[PDB]
Paper text:
Alpha-B.1.1.7, Beta-B.1.351, Gamma-P.1, and Delta-B.1.617.2 variants of SARS-CoV-2 express multiple mutations in the spike protein (S). The RBD mutations found in Alpha (N501Y), Beta (K417N, E484K, and N501Y), Gamma (K417T, E484K, and N501Y), and Delta (L452R and T478K) are located in or closely adjacent to the ACE2-interacting surface where they have the potential to modulate ACE2 interaction or disrupt the binding of neutralizing mAbs. To understand this, we generated 674 mAbs from Beta-infected individuals and performed a detailed structure-function analysis of the 27 most potent mAbs: one binding the spike N-terminal domain (NTD), the rest the receptor-binding domain (RBD). A detailed structure-function analysis comprising 22 X-ray and cryo-EM structures is presented for 16 Fabs most in complexes with RBD or S, which allows an understanding of the changes in antigenicity of the Beta S protein.
Beta-32 is highly potent against all variants reported here. We determined the high-resolution crystal structure of the Fab and the cryo-EM structure of the Fab in complex with Beta S. Fab binds to two RBDs in the up configuration. Although there is some ambiguity in the mode of association, it is clear that there are strong interactions centered on residue 501. The Beta-32-binding mode is radically different to that observed for the gene families IgVH4-39 and IgVH3-53 discussed earlier. Thus, the 501 interactions are via the HC instead of the LC as seen for the IgVH3-53 mAbs, and the angle of attack of Beta-32 compared with Beta-6 is slewed ∼90° toward the back of the RBD. Thus, Beta-32 has found a cross-reactive mode of engagement with the right shoulder of the RBD.
Numbering used by the authors:
A (entry chain C): 27 to 69, 80 to 143, 165 to 172, 186 to 245, 260 to 465, 489 to 617, 638 to 643
B (entry chain H): 1 to 125
C (entry chain L): 1 to 107
D (entry chain A): 165 to 172, 186 to 245, 260 to 297
The structure:
């Protein structure tokens, strides 16, 4: 069930006295005319969300509703605020109460306090750990629904509990309908009378007339046209564009090489002047060991480097762990040494099917003795491995590829190919053309760009058009529609009907009359 | 048959050292690590360290670092565990065990299998 | 280091019973867990590795399950020769560590 | 120790070679001419064709002649130029903002 909240849910935002003044404040208020869930207590006490604050109201004739429970689990496992009003004694506790499956009243505590015809409205919000309670009691004569009217709720209690409250439940006296609303960060114009009592309010987002009233800081609007808010079309999706195939890098001939070199005579391949597509490392799940140092593989297709070096060799499983900075052993010290500040990735996979013979593959060698340890990235050119098909996993051959990334004070030719998306025309999008980003409408154009020209600019030096890197067509960039909202109204002494003018826009993005 | 056969039980005085041997047969000796695990009166199992018989490298549990030495003699496919400065709570059953590799969990080679029969070392005067 | 907690410490069961033994790791070890059986006077023997893989030659009434921190050794149909102490062991990180063991007795 | 490889009077072939932050930028324009004595007089803008991120410190250069062709060498300066773009985006004229007071006024 739902009812009309009308103008309920306005409370004093602070403890400041004001009079004969209209004060504009932004706080968590109940939006005007919003829907609040209507519960009944006749012939129904569910747990409701708390979100960012809850508006509560009830109508009484026999004091059926006597308390509230606020918390997260309500099962003695966490702290839960308990408020009980029995006859003449208001009781507030924050103990870890063990509540029944259906709490009701018949006819490690850190705080304790002891003190239809009646409408009792409440607001419960938690700001930086402070549980603020507002309320107002007024006589009413209405059973069916909430009375219509306006009444401000004064603060009464402020408990610095610091408790994360996400759910709440009501308490009924069994031998009383209640409403639950939610607060939003709306701006309200509050009217303070000569006695400092709030007598009216304007919700600055209910409708264009309320926006006009807030703009003029008045509850009366003179006849005329007022500018109250700027209209701006929002983008719907992003567009990422890179060439389909600019230039790839020969990573295939490094990993899928027919034959590999020994670890002492490790082979180095230089990668320069090509877009580095690392998706062959992501897709290919045929890798046994994949460890990176100094850089992350996910954030690698969007990062440039001056040069990339691909070192490849063959070792056994017990030695794969030695291909890392700060490692020691025959391979690290005598065959292949990585510096302590190495920035790259180490990849290895079991190559027992390729680098093993029935009589033992002895073509892969390794340096056994040396008078000193190798310097980082040193190649000194011996004992033979000789792998067999029945070797243990630690003694089976492994093909290792070590990618190392350097960044010097020189131009970076190796960066990375980022995935492209489809292009959407005649819609407000957030586009990215070869790294140039912006927001605007992409349309077809008749601008004859020269083969070497990629971007266009207007007199103001802003981007006018771009050439699609995949299909050599020229697309115009028109910034997304924007302007202003003006409200055309006769004075509030005659009518509350208004007309809205959206300045310098078409009647598209928004009894509609198109004017210049 | 793959088997690990250990040397016989010994009594050693507190402060002395003991050297237990583990002769391997029936498999490629340099192709598997040899680990040592001991079992004290309260039958808990306690890993001590490993030796790589191919490279000669070792790695010891921090509890025994500075007090244990693991070695091997490939020519007779035997591993050794020497524990020095023996104390009363070093009285235990000492096991050698074969482990194929320390990377891939998914293979049966890469767990303790098989084990030696154990060597009871009693530390007493 | 990774602590392995086994439960129960002891269990008495009848021939033909289904028996479950649990092992909890102090942190995630994926599937890097094994189960060993130690019969009286004998060295431990690998039963289950990689949490759920059956060691060759081991009777299939011994099975394992679990991943992460919680692991279970199951004996689906207890036999008199299953009188033994059972140990879990993690291989995720050195030092490799064992549970305290579960003693199985036969009613 | 090669780090890069690429394989693809009547004619005037003009080039500009400059190195900015390690990038070797090559511009050129080919046009038919009918003049042997000297450079033809006129204006023609050079489009970019190649940009090699070599990062090499270049201080000297030499030409290569085919033996069984005059050439000119100029130097660039940090001058300010006013560039005239036509309706097709082609540079058709230019003002050197330091050639003389009239160019400064323009
Ligand atoms: C109440 O909620 C806040 C926010 O959800 C909790 O703050 C978190 O505290 C933990 C550790 O104390 C941090 O790791 C989180 O990042 C914090 N959240 C945020 C959004 O920063 C706070 O701990 C909660 N209080 C209680 C008692 O549970
Ligand atoms: C290219 O020239 C620059 C500048 O002359 C060189 O940069 C110098 O580098 C050394 C050490 O690398 C520094 O001590 C100098 O101070 C740098 N010069 C300046 C002006 O700061 C650069 O090294 C040269 N590149 C090569 C390959 O020789
Ligand atoms: C709230 O509910 C009423 C009917 O119960 C409906 O007319 C009104 O449009 C609803 N509010 C919104 C914002 O949809
Ligand atoms: C009201 O509730 C409190 C809290 O449970 C209880 O101690 C008290 O006895 C109740 N009755 C009165 C009359 O205060
Ligand atoms: C009591 O509640 C507080 C909440 O601030 C909590 O920190 C404390 O550990 C709790 N003590 C017990 C014994 O539950
Ligand atoms: C303010 O209070 C006085 C009595 O204290 C009352 O007479 C007066 O009417 C009140 N002001 C308004 C605007 O009601
Ligand atoms: C990139 O896309 C265009 C448009 O279809 C196509 O003509 C071109 O051949 C593509 N690139 C390659 C390398 O195939
Ligand atoms: C309303 O105010 C306007 C002032 O612009 C005035 O011209 C008009 O006559 C007023 N109407 C009434 C009914 O007071
Ligand atoms: C508005 O849009 C319509 C079609 O969507 C078009 O015919 C008309 O010319 C547009 N007007 C302006 C001013 O853009
Ligand atoms: C090859 O040239 C590079 C220049 O970047 C230099 O660093 C490298 O040492 C050279 N290698 C040899 C063997 O000359
Ligand atoms: C631009 O190019 C068109 C043909 O594509 C040509 O007709 C036109 O004259 C050119 N513009 C100028 C200023 O020469």
């Amino acid at each position: 069930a739902y009812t009309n909240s009308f103008t309920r849910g306005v409370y004093y935002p602070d403890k400041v006295f004001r009079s004969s003044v209209l004060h504009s404040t932004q706080d968590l208020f109940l939006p005007f005319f919003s829907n609040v869930t209507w519960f009944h207590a006749i012939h129904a006490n569910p747990v409701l969300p708390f979100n960012d604050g809850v508006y509560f109201a009830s109508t009484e004739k026999s004091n059926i509703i006597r308390g509230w429970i606020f918390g997260t689990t309500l099962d003695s496992k966490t702290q839960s605020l308990l408020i009980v009003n029995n006859a003449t004694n208001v009781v507030i506790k924050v103990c870890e109460f063990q509540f029944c499956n259906d709490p009701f009243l018949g006819v490690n505590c850190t705080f304790e306090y002891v003190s239809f015809k009646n409408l009792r409205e409440f607001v419960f919000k938690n700001i930086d750990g402070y549980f603020k309670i507002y309320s107002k009691h007024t006589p009413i004569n209405l059973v069916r629904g909430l009375p219509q009217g306006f009444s401000a709720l004064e603060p009464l209690v402020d408990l610095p509990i610091g408790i994360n409250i996400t759910r709440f439940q009501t308490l009924h006296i069994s031998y009383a309908a209640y409403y639950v609303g939610y607060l939003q960060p709306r701006t309200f114009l509050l009217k303070y009378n000569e006695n400092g009592t709030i007598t009216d309010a304007v919700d600055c987002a209910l409708d264009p007339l309320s926006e006009t009233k807030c703009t003029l800081k008045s509850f009366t609007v003179e006849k005329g046209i007022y500018q109250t808010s700027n209209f701006r079309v929002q983008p719907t999706e992003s567009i990422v564009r890179f060439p389909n195939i600019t230039n790839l890098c020969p990573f295939g001939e490094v990993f899928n090489a027919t034959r590999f070199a020994s670890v002492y005579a490790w082979n180095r391949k230089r990668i320069s002047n090509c877009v580095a597509d690392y998706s062959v490392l992501y897709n290919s799940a045929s890798f046994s060991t994949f460890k990176c140092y100094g850089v992350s593989p996910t954030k690698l297709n969007d990062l440039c480097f001056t040069n990339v070096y691909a070192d490849s060799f063959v070792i056994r499983g017990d030695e794969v762990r030695q291909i890392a900075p700060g490692q020691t052993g025959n391979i690290a010290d005598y065959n292949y040494k990585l510096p302590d500040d190495f920035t790259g990735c180490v990849i290895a996979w079991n190559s027992n099917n390729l680098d093993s013979k029935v009589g033992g593959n002895y073509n892969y060698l390794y340096r056994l003795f040396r008078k000193s340890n190798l310097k980082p990235f040193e190649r000194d050119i011996l004992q033979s491995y000789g792998f067999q098909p029945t070797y243990g996993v630690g003694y089976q051959p492994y093909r290792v590829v070590v990618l190392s990334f350097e960044l010097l004070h020189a131009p970076a030719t190796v960066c990375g190919p980022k995935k492209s998306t489809n292009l959407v025309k005649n819609k407000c999008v957030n586009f990215n053309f070869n790294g140039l980003t912006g927001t605007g409408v992409l349309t077809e154009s008749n601008k004859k760009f020269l083969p070497f020209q990629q971007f266009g600019r207007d007199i103001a030096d802003t981007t006018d058009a771009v050439r699609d890197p995949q299909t050599l067509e020229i697309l115009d960039i028109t910034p997304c529609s924007f302007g202003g909202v003006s409200v055309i109204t006769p004075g509030t002494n005659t009518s509350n009907q208004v007309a809205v003018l959206y300045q310098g826009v078409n009647c598209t993005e928004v009894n509609v009359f198109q004017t210049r | 048959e793959v088997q690990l056969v250990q040397s016989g039980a010994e009594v050693k005085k507190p402060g002395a050292s003991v050297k237990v041997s583990c002769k391997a047969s029936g498999y490629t000796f340099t192709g598997y690590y040899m680990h040592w695990v001991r079992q004290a009166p309260g039958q808990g199992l306690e890993w001590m360290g490993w030796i790589n018989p191919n490279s000669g490298g070792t790695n010891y549990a921090q509890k025994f670092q500075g007090r244990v030495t693991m070695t091997r003699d490939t020519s007779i496919t035997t591993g050794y565990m020497e524990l020095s400065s023996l104390r009363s709570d070093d009285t235990a059953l000492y096991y050698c065990a074969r482990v194929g590799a320390h990377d891939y969990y998914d293979s049966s080679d890469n767990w303790f299998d098989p084990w030696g029969q154990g060597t009871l070392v009693t530390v007493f005067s | 280091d990774i602590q392995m907690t086994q439960s129960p410490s002891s269990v008495s069961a009848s021939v033909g019973d289904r028996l479950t033994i649990t092992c909890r790791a102090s942190q995630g070890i994926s599937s890097w867990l094994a189960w060993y059986q130690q019969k009286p006077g004998k060295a431990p023997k690998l039963l289950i590795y990689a949490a759920s893989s059956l060691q060759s030659g081991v009777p299939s009434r011994f099975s394992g399950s679990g991943s992460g921190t919680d692991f279970t050794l199951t004996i689906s149909s207890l036999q008199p020769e299953d009188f033994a102490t059972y140990y879990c062991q993690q291989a995720n990180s050195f030092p490799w560590t064992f549970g305290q063991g579960t003693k199985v007795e036969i009613k």
